[PDB]
Amino acid sequence: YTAAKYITETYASKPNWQAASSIASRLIKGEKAKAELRSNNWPFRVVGIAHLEKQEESDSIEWFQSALRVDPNDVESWVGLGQAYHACGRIEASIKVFDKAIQLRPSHTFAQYFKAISLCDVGEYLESLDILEKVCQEAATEESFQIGLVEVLMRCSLDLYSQGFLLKSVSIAKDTIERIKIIISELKCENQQVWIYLSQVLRLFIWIESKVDTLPVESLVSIFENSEEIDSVDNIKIDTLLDSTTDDNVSIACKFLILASKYSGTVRASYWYNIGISELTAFITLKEPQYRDAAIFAFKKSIQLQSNTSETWIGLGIATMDINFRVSQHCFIKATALEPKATNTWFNLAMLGLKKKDTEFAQQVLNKLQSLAPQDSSPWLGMALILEEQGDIIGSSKLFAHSFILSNGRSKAAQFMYAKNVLENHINNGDDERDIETVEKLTTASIALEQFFKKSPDSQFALQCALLTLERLHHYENANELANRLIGILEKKFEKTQDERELFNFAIIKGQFARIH
Amino acid sequence: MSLLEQLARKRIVSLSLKLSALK
């Protein structure tokens, strides 16, 4: 025992845990240390810890539980048991264990950080944020605590975005960007995780475009000023960014999005895939060929790195939708073969088939997708579009309504098509204002358009539809602002090309604006 | 005054500015 303890503590401080585990196991199994082992729990603790750095987490649970039964006051045994429970998908048990360990030793620091991570995993952002803020206040030198705080901030912002809290998501994104700027400026610590977090945060400003002017362009400059194959295509550089003119807010947002991907073979494949995804987002948002070329180049390199992931094939198929349909078809087939449980590839193939005006193939694939994922709102949208193209009107309306109900506000296209269909079905139908169903449909369409304008404003067709709906709903105060924005957009559009065909819509907009007054 | 309005009568950003100022 005494000699065994000496050897164990000598090997534990090397550190070298395999030998310590072997010695503890041969001491326990010897059955000659009966009386001594009922007062101390160091051998079981060493065995559990050694299993813990071996990443065989489930094997150390029993050892930590035995060591805790022997001594219920071991804080490190509780911490090890909780960190083992977390890796086994036992998050609530780990939360309770971390609470117990904190209760024994309130000054313990890593326990609070682990508890905050677990609370974030189960979806308790307020308590975890408070814990991590207090921990970072107590000791700001630790890099892991700051990275964890940024991680929790980003996850909370994304969860709020998915839940429909679009106004606090941008505020939490700004807080995350400020924290990242603080980290890079003061700690001078760089890692791939923080740049991935920044890129995830930057998508919130592009997605919520009505709040894009709030982007902290001052902190981002210092973030990109305190740290070549693809540079010749996109030509996106910090110097070119600074010395630029006649550039819109959204374009600057997308160019900022494509700098964290370039400032960070599995790791290299992920790096190039991230750059390609950012460039694909920029190409979809701005519609310029050089972004498409850069995205294809990055996707090709990432495929040449691993070629065993579905997402790279989906991205390659998306980036080559118009240049060639056979290439997109092959990419989508390969992606589906790689991961058969993903329902997005079938929808992408359906959209590709619809873009080539092949209705039967799209109908067949959408029937299969509906059999596969009935709860998603995209197959219903595709079927509604197909039936609208064919000529059926009642079924198209029913499918649009079902898609809108299933979307639960998470789809812009569902809202737009539902509003357009409702307006089309009730524009010259000869109905009165005493019908509850029609007024409720108009109210739902107005609410859907209000939600739509928060993500993609300055859309002429949606603005006109909303103006008509608000005129029907007697909401003359919102229609004034909407018509002012529409008039401004039309004036800006017609003051650049210097055309004259826009005078026809100008008169109609002026007449509607006069009706609103 | 607007160019389109003038033509009709005859026939009858933030992020960039802040970026330049900061630099």
């Binding site: 750095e53 490190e76 086994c88 790791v267 991961e339 | -």
Partner: protein, 43 residues
Amino acid sequence: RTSYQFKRTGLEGKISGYKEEVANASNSLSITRSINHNQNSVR
């Protein structure tokens, strides 16, 4: 694909240092898949 790992030191293992080392409900059958808080955790 990168994460954090904790390496305790000495007897009565306490966290000493960290190193930078190299799936949803509808995709994986693993117990370690991500938990979605929108759905019921009981039914």
